[PDB]
Amino acid sequence: CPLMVKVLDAVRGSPAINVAVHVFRKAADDTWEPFASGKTSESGELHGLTTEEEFVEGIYKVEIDTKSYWKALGISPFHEHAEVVFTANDSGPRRYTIAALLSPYSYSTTAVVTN
Amino acid sequence: CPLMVKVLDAVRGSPAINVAVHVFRKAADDTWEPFASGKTSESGELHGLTTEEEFVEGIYKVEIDTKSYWKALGISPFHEHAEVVFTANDSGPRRYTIAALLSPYSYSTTAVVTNP
Amino acid sequence: CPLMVKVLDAVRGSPAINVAVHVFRKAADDTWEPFASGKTSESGELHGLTTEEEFVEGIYKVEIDTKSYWKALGISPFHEHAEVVFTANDSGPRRYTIAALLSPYSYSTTAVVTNP
Amino acid sequence: CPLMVKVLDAVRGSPAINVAVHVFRKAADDTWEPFASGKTSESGELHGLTTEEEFVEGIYKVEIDTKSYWKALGISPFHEHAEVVFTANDSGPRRYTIAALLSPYSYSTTAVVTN
Ligand SMILES: COc1ccc2c(c1)c(CC(=O)O)c(C)n2C(=O)c1ccc(Cl)cc1
Numbered sequence A, D: 001c002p003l004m005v006k007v008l009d010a011v012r013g014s015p016a017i018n019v020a021v022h023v024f025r026k027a028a029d030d031t032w033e034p035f036a037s038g039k040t041s042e043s044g045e046l047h048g049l050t051t052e053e054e055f056v057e058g059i060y061k062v063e064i065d066t067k068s069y070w071k072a073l074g075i076s077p078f079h080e081h082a083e084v085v086f087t088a089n090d091s092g093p094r095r096y097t098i099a100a101l102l103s104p105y106s107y108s109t110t111a112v113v114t115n
Numbered sequence B, C: 001c002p003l004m005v006k007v008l009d010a011v012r013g014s015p016a017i018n019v020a021v022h023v024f025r026k027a028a029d030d031t032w033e034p035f036a037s038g039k040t041s042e043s044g045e046l047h048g049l050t051t052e053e054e055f056v057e058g059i060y061k062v063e064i065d066t067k068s069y070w071k072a073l074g075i076s077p078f079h080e081h082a083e084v085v086f087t088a089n090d091s092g093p094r095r096y097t098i099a100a101l102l103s104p105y106s107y108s109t110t111a112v113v114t115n116p
């Protein structure tokens, strides 16, 4: 599992569950090609997005649908979605965890890159 | 000034100076049209991007070029840039401050929205 | 103004207004002595806590009373308060801005330190 | 394991390893009583701090020695340590994860409280 996503909710202090996540890979014409998607689980996590064969070096974008998550909770959010854009590179450690901590008007995102 | 950008460096405890910022607006055909651009100053702030009249309702994308910034400090950062995407002015004109706190493998972004 | 405090609310996208702040300074006997206190204004800022002369070298603790703040908004927050603990002025006088971004179960704190 | 600590490093994008963590419980005279301590592991985590029998309701303080972590990396940090102060309460979910994301001049901390 070379690419994992973890989403937490900073208002409730819980995993953010059932959050839609879309991954895109940057194509040679600079457009964004759908690559992988899913919904976070009960633990706020999304696994099994891709395999080490398909996850080649390149620029990827992870798009976390935060606006629908907040609307389902009845809370009026600022952002359309959170967007994490990064280059996957074979030299460094192999596992990428993209984490996001969500508030209605703020979010943070971190990359944990390990072996 | 209805749209301003404020960038901090979380490694140096200082404003993030000369950070490039590109703003886009989603057009009717659903593409991102170039809306305004600039660089943060000595105070890590970017003002005068647009005017109330020009800053109409729509979905905006503020792209803060963090990777260029880090590289010139000799750091090799994780992200290409920070993207901040939001509906603006969809209940009448507001003032928006987009703030970003940068680390090489992390950033946070918040909005302060006030009513004229 | 050598020590100022800036507080944002990450749920409302607004300054955090009327947040109580207590600053302490570690004394020679190793206890926390009361140093200064105040409340954030309409802009979420707190100024005039101390003077350059009074703000000598030492270890300071800025306690931001976040739990009181959240409760008055009807929220039941996780933390009692944010604590920010740092050596100040140990290479000559500096200006410090302590910033905090509050959510009910999370906060972030950053320092902007500048040289007179 | 009612109380777990997770520490990440925002400059390297890795777990923060070998970080000392001291937990205190607030005594009736308002002083801080040492309660539990340890060092984060290779995965940036600290487990086995306490048991559900000893972790009674009360105010606790978790003190993460960030200054020594940054000094070991040769990086000049702002804070003496990060301090997470909170009330443990029996009504809510049972597992407390205190997470901290560290930069030299900034940190964030989040509580994930679950079942
Ligand atoms: C009211 O509008 C803002 C918003 C955020 C601000 C400031 C002003 C100032 C002060 C100034 O205007 O110079 C600082 C220092 N801000 C931050 O620290 C900051 C940076 C990034 C994040 Cl994610 C959260 C907060």
Ligand SMILES: COc1ccc2c(c1)c(CC(=O)O)c(C)n2C(=O)c1ccc(Cl)cc1
Pocket (backbone or CB within 6 Å): A006, A097, A098, A099, A100, A101, A108, A110, A111, A112, C106, D006, D008, D097, D099, D100, D101, D108, D109, D110, D112
């Ligand atoms: C429940 O377990 C957690 C909790 C938080 C986590 C992670 C795992 C991972 C995954 C990992 O460690 O690989 C990351 C990246 N987390 C963060 O990003 C994070 C974000 C904000 C703060 Cl304030 C503190 C930590």
